[PDB]
Amino acid sequence: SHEQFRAALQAVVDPGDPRSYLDNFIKIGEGSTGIVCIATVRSSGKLVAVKKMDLRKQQRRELLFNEVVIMRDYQHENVVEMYNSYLVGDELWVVMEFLEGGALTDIVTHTRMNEEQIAAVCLAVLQALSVLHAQGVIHRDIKSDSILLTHDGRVKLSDFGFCAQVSKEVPRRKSLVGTPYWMAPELISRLPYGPEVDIWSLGIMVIEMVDGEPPYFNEPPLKAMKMIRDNLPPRLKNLHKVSPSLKGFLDRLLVRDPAQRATAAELLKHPFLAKAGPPASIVPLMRQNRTR
Ligand SMILES: CNC(=O)c1ccc2ncsc2c1
Questions:
Q1: What is the DSSP string of 217-268?
Q2: Does the CB atom of residue 148 touch ligand 1 within 6 A?
Q3: Residue 29 marked as a ligand binder
């Protein structure tokens, strides 16, 4: 019953209607759970983003609860700040920070990132992931689309709609969740899994940043998963174009056996990350500075 779920949700969200203090909604994007508008706080002129998820157009609508679990409990500097959540009509609305340097997908699609810039992205995702993983939270949809930048070039994780939680009582997850190309093979094999699955997907994102797209991006989703499961770790299209120090890094990420994969915390001490630049090194890549 759609109505029963709307009622369940009302019990966990902030009361009211944000359209009472917001002005001039403009669509800026779409995910798989919903769309993203920006609005203007009416009194102050600050901008915010509002994530709009229709309750009737979800694969599993119980995952919508993840938005509020994360907003309540797992806020952190390398994670998007989510301010309030409402039930509006038949939609859930999350008001959050507007990350105005946009998504990393736009950068990888049109640009050639260098290793200083790649290393800064990787560092900041791994800061986030170690902290989350230590609390047993697995993100489960790591990809360029999930990484947002501020105008001044600081990297934050987004799109926690598919995340899940592990612990002594529930030590592994079993669900088939994410975006096919970035899925870890243990996950595709339906092994029970842990946070190691985010480390694999980060690798795939490294390859995004190096090659421009993930492995097997030309096959339909179903066939490429078969491919990930069977064949060995995918190779850079452009192996010759990467320092041995970054090959050394990717090699610790794209391990098929989850037990021998690196952890977010171990990978923080890997030498490839010493090359990380500041935030400012990423600013040139953004569409508003790229051609200028
Ligand atoms: C393609 N753009 C986007 O999807 C986008 C951009 C900024 C932002 N700030 C909070 S959510 C969010 C999404």
A1: TTS-HHHHHHHHHHS-S---TTGGGS-HHHHHHHHHHS-SSTTTS--HHHHT
A2: yes
A3: yes
